[PDB]
Amino acid sequence: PRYKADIGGGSLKLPESRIIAGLLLEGVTEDQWRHAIEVENVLQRAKRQSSLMRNRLETMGPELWQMVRDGSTQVAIQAVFAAAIKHSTLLGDFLDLVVRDQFRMFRPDLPRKMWDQYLEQCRNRDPLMDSTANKLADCVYRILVEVGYITYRLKSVRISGEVMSYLRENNEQYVIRCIQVS
Structure with missing residues (x-):
């Protein structure tokens, strides 16, 4: 299926994503990944949302994980945004x-009827x-608020050169096309 609803499980959630990016950069076994989330409680709380945030980041590589973990607020959130796009054709389209x-x-x-009618088309x-x-629509618009695209008035947002360089260097044609639309 081209379009799926996985994206609705949660918005970008930078703080949590930074912790997951740390775990990706340290390197843990799958069993240990689940233990860290569920038992050690590294997010300070469940399971599905963390799987999503990880699945998102694992479409990308260590360079971008390092940006998520270490970068400034805008740089890190945009890197998470690119990962969310790569993971979700529904968002990207x-x-x-x-x-x-x-x-x-x-x-x-970008009033809500536009999302509605897009789904009709999908x-x-x-x-x-x-x-x-409903949770799906809410999540997509929350992502757009987080990155700064959203009166539902839209504003242009300059994607950091650090994120764009990573995307070009990694041949991320599709993310490139979708991430900068202003």
Whole structure:
């Protein structure tokens, strides 16, 4: 299936993502990964959300994990954003096919009907595709608030040169196209 709902499990959540990026950079066995999250309680609380944040980062490599763990607030959040895009065609295609064209308006906005109608299109496009839907929409817009794209008025956001260099150097065509749409 082209579009899946996994992205709805949680927004970028930088603080937690930094801890997970640490664990990725240290190197632990899978059993130890689960122990650190669930028993040692490294996130200071469950399981599904941490799997998502990890699955997101594991689409990318140590260089970007190091950015998440060590970088400034904006650099780290944007690296997490790129990972979220790579992990989710549903998010990436929202950016690519809807958000990008909105920035053609004067005073671009992104009202919820636009998400609704995008989902209508996604269904059309993917023959293999309530409470989940609502949490889903909320999560996508929260991501966009976190990165700074969102009156539902849209604003342009400059992706850090450090993140963009990583993406170019790693051939991340699709993330590149979706991450910068302003």
